[PDB]
Symmetry: C7
Subunit: 30 residues, 7 copies
């Protein structure tokens, strides 16, 4: 369904946030 | 539907947050 | 509809979060 | 409606996160 | 209703995030 | 209901994010 | 149901955000 699929897109985008934060940790480490 | 499309807007906004966090990582790396 | 409109407000607020994080990147670059 | 009003509260809370991130930016520029 | 109440719980949790971020700002000011 | 229960899981996860951000604050204070 | 399952996916993604922030904390501490 379209509402479920849209919520799945929100989940995917939040995973992108997690990855970007892992990039921040990596930057801090060098 | 209007609810699904609005939820898609949330996903896109969250992607913008991920990108902004990538810029923080790059700021730290520099 | 009221639910869709409210969800759009959530999207707009998340964009505000992205802009604030960019300020953090610029502060670091500072 | 109660669901729309609750979602608007989520939006309001996300605005507070944005303000808090602005405080982090100020602290860094500090 | 249970859905509206659950969404209010999300709003409250997000406020906790805003408070946590303020602690980061204060730590940086330290 | 399952939808309310899933939304409660989202609130629980957001609280975990708040705790992690407090951990960042301790690390900075460190 | 598909909507509840999608929301659970959002919850799981938010947990990934929390774990990533813990990596940021550990990076700062080290």
């Amino acid at each position: 369904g379209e509402v479920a699929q849209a919520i799945k897109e929100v989940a995917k985008a939040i995973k992108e946030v997690a990855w970007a934060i892992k990039e921040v940790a990596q930057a801090i480490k060098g």
